[PDB]
Design a protein around this ligand. Structure first.
Ligand SMILES: NCc1ccc(S(N)(=O)=O)cc1
Ligand SMILES: [Zn+2]
Length: 259
């Protein structure tokens, strides 16, 4: 640890030294890492990957959202959970965050068939374990965001909040909203890809069961741009928050499956 981890854009846009992704520590240099490219036609169908059950996702709340220095993060505080989805247990929702750029063809961490989307939203959940840490301790739901001209009304509480948390360690309260307001129609979430991997920031622990849904969220270009326009990596506000994306990792001998 000669300096704090950063994204490539941070090193490029500031003179202050920081560790770019290819130099990250902890478990980041191991071999079941994320994100990956998914060749959709090569992922095998597994019949056991059934529909998800969301609990607490329809409920209107006033979520707390904060700039943690490398993303914007809603604190979910177990107020929601998931089961199904071919998962081994229910998982409790901890936080929701995003990764983005300011060009429509980049911003996502994963790629489908070599295409990056304009953003990627991660909902982070924790395993309800039994008595017998594991490979699937964390379930992250990943949604790709496609830029367009459709105004997503569901996103507007989040987008309006961004103005209030431009600097790291700032928090605010969003207007009344549900998690489903942020997602595609539930019927469209039957198609997803599944693999085992890591967290995409240090320490990059290899304890994540990944789900990447095929159906993108549609967001207006300018709702996407609001992220890089309103947020900063630093209190000095010298580097607009964008390209908070880990580069693609090698699948190696792992297998990707789909519903
Ligand atoms: N702060 C721990 C943490 C949680 C979630 C991720 S991610 N990008 O979903 O893989 C990374 C780090
Ligand atoms: Zn993430």
């Amino acid at each position: 640890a000669e300096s704090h981890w950063c994204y490539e854009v941070q090193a490029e846009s500031s003179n202050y030294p920081c560790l770019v992704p290819v130099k990250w520590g902890g478990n980041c240099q191991k071999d079941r890492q994320s994100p990956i490219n998914i060749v959709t036609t090569k992922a095998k169908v597994d019949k056991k990957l059934g529909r998800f059950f969301f609990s607490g996702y329809d409920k209107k709340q006033t979520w707390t959202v904060q700039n943690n220095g490398h993303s914007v993060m809603m604190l979910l505080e177990n107020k929601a959970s998931i089961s199904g989805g071919g998962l081994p247990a229910p998982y409790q929702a901890k936080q929701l965050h995003l990764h983005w750029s300011d060009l429509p063809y980049k911003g996502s961490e994963h790629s489908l068939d070599g295409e990056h989307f304009a953003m990627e939203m991660h909902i982070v959940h924790e395993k309800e374990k039994g008595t017998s840490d594991p490979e699937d301790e964390i379930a992250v739901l990943a949604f790709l965001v496609e830029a367009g001209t459709q105004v997503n009304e569901g996103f507007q509480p989040l987008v309006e909040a961004l103005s209030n948390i431009p600097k790291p360690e700032m928090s605010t309260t969003m207007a009344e909203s549900s998690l489903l307001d942020l997602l595609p129609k539930e019927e469209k979430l039957r198609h997803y890809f599944r693999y085992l991997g890591s967290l995409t920031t240090p320490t990059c622990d290899e304890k994540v069961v990944w789900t990447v849904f095929r159906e993108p969220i549609q967001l207006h270009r300018e709702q996407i741009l609001a992220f890089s326009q309103k947020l900063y990596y630093d209190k000095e506000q010298t580097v607009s928050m964008k390209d908070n994306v880990r580069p693609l990792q090698q699948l190696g001998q792992r297998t990707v499956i789909k519903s």
